[PDB]
Design an enzyme around this catalytic site. Structure first.
Site, PDB file in Angstrom:
ATOM      1  N   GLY B  11       0.808  -1.206   0.000  1.00 60.04           N
ATOM      2  CA  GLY B  11       0.000   0.000   0.000  1.00 60.04           C
ATOM      3  C   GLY B  11       0.844   1.260   0.000  1.00 60.04           C
ATOM      4  N   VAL B  17       5.624   4.907  -0.044  1.00 60.95           N
ATOM      5  CA  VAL B  17       5.164   3.538  -0.295  1.00 60.95           C
ATOM      6  C   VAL B  17       5.565   2.585   0.841  1.00 60.95           C
ATOM      7  CG1 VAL B  17       7.024   3.643  -2.056  1.00 60.95           C
ATOM      8  CG2 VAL B  17       5.719   1.477  -1.715  1.00 60.95           C
ATOM      9  N   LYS B  33       7.775   2.377   5.546  1.00 58.90           N
ATOM     10  CA  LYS B  33       7.469   3.512   4.696  1.00 58.90           C
ATOM     11  C   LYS B  33       8.728   4.211   4.210  1.00 58.90           C
ATOM     12  CE  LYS B  33       3.626   6.825   5.174  1.00 58.90           C
ATOM     13  NZ  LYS B  33       2.481   6.797   6.141  1.00 58.90           N
ATOM     14  N   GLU B  81       5.509  -0.854  13.488  1.00 55.41           N
ATOM     15  CA  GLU B  81       5.073  -2.173  13.872  1.00 55.41           C
ATOM     16  C   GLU B  81       4.115  -2.629  12.783  1.00 55.41           C
ATOM     17  OE1 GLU B  81       1.401  -0.943  16.933  1.00 55.41           O
ATOM     18  OE2 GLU B  81       2.754  -2.667  17.301  1.00 55.41           O
ATOM     19  N   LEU B  83       0.762  -4.339  11.122  1.00 60.43           N
ATOM     20  CA  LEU B  83      -0.619  -4.710  11.433  1.00 60.43           C
ATOM     21  C   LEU B  83      -1.230  -5.297  10.168  1.00 60.43           C
ATOM     22  CD1 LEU B  83      -1.065  -1.502  13.480  1.00 60.43           C
ATOM     23  CD2 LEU B  83      -1.818  -3.750  14.188  1.00 60.43           C
ATOM     24  N   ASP B  86      -6.373  -3.023   6.900  1.00 59.42           N
ATOM     25  CA  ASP B  86      -7.210  -1.879   7.219  1.00 59.42           C
ATOM     26  C   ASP B  86      -8.698  -2.135   7.316  1.00 59.42           C
ATOM     27  OD1 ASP B  86      -8.463  -1.230   4.446  1.00 59.42           O
ATOM     28  OD2 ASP B  86      -6.299  -1.091   4.028  1.00 59.42           O
ATOM     29  N   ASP B 127      -7.809  13.300   9.626  1.00 58.29           N
ATOM     30  CA  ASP B 127      -8.146  12.527   8.441  1.00 58.29           C
ATOM     31  C   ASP B 127      -8.510  11.106   8.804  1.00 58.29           C
ATOM     32  OD1 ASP B 127      -8.301  12.798   5.470  1.00 58.29           O
ATOM     33  OD2 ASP B 127      -6.329  11.817   5.438  1.00 58.29           O
ATOM     34  N   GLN B 131      -9.838   3.420   5.754  1.00 57.00           N
ATOM     35  CA  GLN B 131      -8.495   3.197   5.242  1.00 57.00           C
ATOM     36  C   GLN B 131      -7.345   3.530   6.167  1.00 57.00           C
ATOM     37  OE1 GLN B 131     -11.205   4.581   2.144  1.00 57.00           O
ATOM     38  NE2 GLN B 131      -9.291   5.412   1.287  1.00 57.00           N
ATOM     39  N   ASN B 132      -7.461   4.507   7.058  1.00 54.10           N
ATOM     40  CA  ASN B 132      -6.418   4.852   8.038  1.00 54.10           C
ATOM     41  C   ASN B 132      -6.428   4.142   9.392  1.00 54.10           C
ATOM     42  OD1 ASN B 132      -5.440   6.667   6.145  1.00 54.10           O
ATOM     43  ND2 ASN B 132      -6.585   8.398   7.002  1.00 54.10           N
TER      44      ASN B 132
END
Lengths: 258, 296, 4
Positions: B11, B17, B33, B81, B83, B86, B127, B131-132
């Site tokens: 994602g 990215v 990221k 970490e 996860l 989503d 935000d 998705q977050n």
């Protein structure tokens, strides 16, 4: 009346001890001095006026410079670059749109290359370990301003001005926490505009008595007074503009009453 | 960075990215990221500047942990970490059957908790959307992606050209308010709550004005009785069609009384009357709370 | 402007 005002205020109070620059750091910079600093900051005041940045941005910028000079030795040639980097960082963090690196280079009369500027951004982020969410005098004044009665546009504008005056001289101000200088500034301005004084809500909220505020009121009163003398005059020309009610024109009291 | 071994992309952040990677020495699995530095272009982007500075302070069970930041001149790496997915993806993978009511209640509770720690550390997320929000196989959920989060030691001003989502935006932002409030995260989370429970977006509009009217048509047109200030707000209009409040029973069918009550306090038009993350956790809705794992 |  948020559920947080208090935890936040407490937190900010905790946070500020962490973020404190070293008190005697200019006395170990072998090539720069408080006065060079004063020049640097007065410039940022203007650079802020020209690009119409917020006043928080300027407080962020000076805090970074002070923490960075607090552990890196910098030559008087490279200090401006450090200031530009810091105004750039603070920009990115506090502003909705920052000016572009190009504009930051321009305002130094093309004196450094935009690569130098970008590479000093990076070096500042390292030295401060990406810790950019520092409390400031402006942060604490905004909190303190919620506890005024009646709210005064003129006390506010003047309090801000005094807080910005303290940004310029590292001695004596590096000795006091932003929470304390906001204290002094709030009272000095409030006194100046109205004869009132540091309220009790604040005394109970902050745990600062007017007494403990004293030593810092002494210094802020002295600056206020020598204000038009000062070798630097950007904060006065700034607060002459009537977006601020021209507070810089109003008359300092000659005596505090304690 | 030579200690991590990239496994696969999973994602893309508002900026940079995200890979799944693994520490070749400790064996830990991590989200990496990776952010390109135009050293010529504009420097370290501000989405990174903010996410790193605020996530470093926000240590809490329902906030994604930033484990380590790796700075080289060319690239900037953010190690999180790991996860497993989503809530958006879980939701699409979970319609037609539906997320169990008490999985929903544990998630909202868990989110209102990190939201509460965020707000008490002067940080607005700004935000929140499915998705977050990240979830693991043990049934934890955590607020992720903080590129738009801002410190509110001083109030935070609105992008008069918003750059900040539609379906989950607050009426006060849609009507052109000068500042944000903690109130805006609560609005979004109420919308995600409604979305978790009814399998579709509460207010899925197509333009700023469509959005305003989708809020109005379900909750009623605001008036000074309900929201003192609205009529004088910069984008408000006497020409606004004038609808009436619908039945929350008919907005959120499968929800008990206790649930409709909380939902409706998270969805107040007035920022000053809208429930806090702190208060919401005290709501009775949260008594029989447990910690189901999802079926992933 | 350039500046010390």
């Amino acid at each position: 009346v948020p559920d947080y005002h208090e935890d936040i205020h407490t937190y900010l109070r905790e946070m500020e001890v962490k973020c404190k620059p070293k008190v005697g750091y200019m006395k170990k910079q072998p090539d720069i001095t408080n006065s060079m600093r004063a020049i640097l900051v007065d410039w940022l005041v203007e650079v802020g006026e020209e690009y119409k940045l917020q006043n928080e941005t300027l407080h962020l910028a000076v805090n970074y410079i002070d923490r960075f000079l607090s552990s890196m030795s910098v030559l008087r040639g490279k200090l401006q670059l450090v200031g530009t980097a810091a105004m750039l960082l603070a920009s990115k963090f506090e502003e909705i749109y920052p000016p572009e690196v190009a504009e930051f280079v321009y305002i130094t009369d093309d004196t450094y290359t935009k690569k130098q500027v970008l590479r000093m951004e990076h070096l500042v982020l390292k030295v401060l370990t990406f810790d950019l969410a520092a409390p400031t005098v402006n942060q604490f004044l905004t909190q303190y301003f919620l506890h005024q009665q009646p709210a005064n546009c003129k006390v506010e504008s003047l309090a801000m001005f005094l807080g910005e005056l303290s940004l310029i001289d590292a001695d004596p101000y590096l000795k006091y926490l932003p929470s304390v200088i906001a204290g002094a500034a709030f009272h000095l301005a409030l006194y100046t505009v109205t004869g009132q004084s540091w309220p009790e809500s604040l005394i109970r909220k902050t745990g600062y008595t007017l007494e403990s505020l004293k030593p810092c009121l002494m210094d802020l009163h002295q600056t206020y007074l020598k204000a038009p003398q000062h070798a630097q005059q950007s904060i006065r020309e700034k607060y002459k503009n009537s977006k601020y009610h021209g507070v810089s024109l109003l008359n300092p009291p000659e005596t505090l009453n304690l | 960075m030579e200690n991590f071994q990239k496994v696969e992309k999973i994602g893309e952040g508002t900026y940079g990215v995200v890979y799944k990677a693994r520490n070749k020495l400790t064996g830990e699995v991590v989200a990496l990221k990776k952010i390109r530095l135009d050293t010529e272009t504009e420097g370290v982007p501000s989405t990174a500047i903010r996410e790193i500075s605020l996530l470093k302070e926000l240590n809490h069970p329902n906030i994604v942990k930033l484990l380590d930041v790796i700075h080289t001149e060319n690239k900037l790496y953010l190690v999180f970490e790991f996860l497993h997915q989503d809530l958006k993806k879980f939701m699409d993978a979970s319609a037609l059957t539906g997320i169990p009511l008490p999985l929903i209640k544990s998630y909202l509770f868990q989110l209102l908790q990190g939201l509460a720690f965020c707000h008490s550390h002067r940080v607005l997320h700004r935000d929140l959307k499915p998705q977050n929000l990240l979830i693991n196989t043990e049934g934890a959920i955590k607020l992720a992606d903080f590129g738009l989060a801002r410190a509110f030691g001083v109030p935070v001003r609105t992008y008069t050209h918003e750059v900040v989502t539609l379906w989950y935006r607050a009426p006060e932002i849609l009507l052109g308010c000068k500042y944000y409030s903690t109130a805006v995260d609560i609005w979004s989370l109420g919308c995600i709550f409604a979305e978790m429970v009814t399998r579709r977006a509460l207010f899925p509009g197509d333009s700023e004005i469509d959005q305003l009217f989708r809020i109005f048509r379900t909750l009623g047109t605001p008036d000074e009785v309900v929201w003192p200030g609205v009529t004088s707000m910069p984008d408000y209009k006497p020409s606004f069609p004038k609808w009436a409040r619908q039945d929350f029973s008919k907005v959120v069918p499968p929800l008990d009384e206790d649930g409709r009550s909380l939902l409706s306090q998270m969805l107040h038009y007035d920022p000053n009357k809208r429930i806090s993350a702190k208060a919401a956790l005290a709501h009775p809705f949260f008594q029989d709370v447990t910690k189901p794992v999802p079926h992933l | 402007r350039r500046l010390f």
